[PDB]
Amino acid sequence: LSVVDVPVPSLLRGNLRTYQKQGLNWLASLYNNHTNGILADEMGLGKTIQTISLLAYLACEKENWGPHLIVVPTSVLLNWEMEFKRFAPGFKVLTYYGSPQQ
C-alpha cells in the first residue's frame, strides 16, 4: 500500500490495538510526501490516540517537536490535555482559555 511501517513510539503509554498502527504509518507516509491528510474514520475509533501517536513518532524519529496546534471544540478542551496526560506524557501541553488575565 506504498506505506513503510516502522515506528519507534517511545515514552508512549499503552499500545495501538492493531487498528491505529495502520493510521500511524499512513500519517507517516503522508508526512513523507509533504501532503495533507483526512482521518475521517468512524466516530469514537480513537482519533486522539492516532494523532498523539503520530506526534510521538514525529518527536522520536525526528528531532523536531516544535510548537504544534490542536484546534478543538470547547467541550473537549480539557479532554485533549488529559488524553495524552493518561497517555504519552513526555510532551509539554498548553491550554489556552480563561479571561484576559491568566
Binding site: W26, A40, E42, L45
Partner: protein
Amino acid sequence: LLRRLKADVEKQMPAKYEHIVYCKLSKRQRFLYDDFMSRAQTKATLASG
C-alpha cells in the same frame, strides 16, 4: 482520505437497535397547534405583515 467503519472492529461490539416511539397530542396543545397552524397557513399563503 482514510475511513474505517465498525467493520474493522466487530469481535466485541454491541449492536445498535433503533426504535421509534409515537406520542399522541394533548388537548390544549392540540388547540395551540391548530390555532398556530391555521393562522400560519392563512398568513403565508397570501398577504401578510
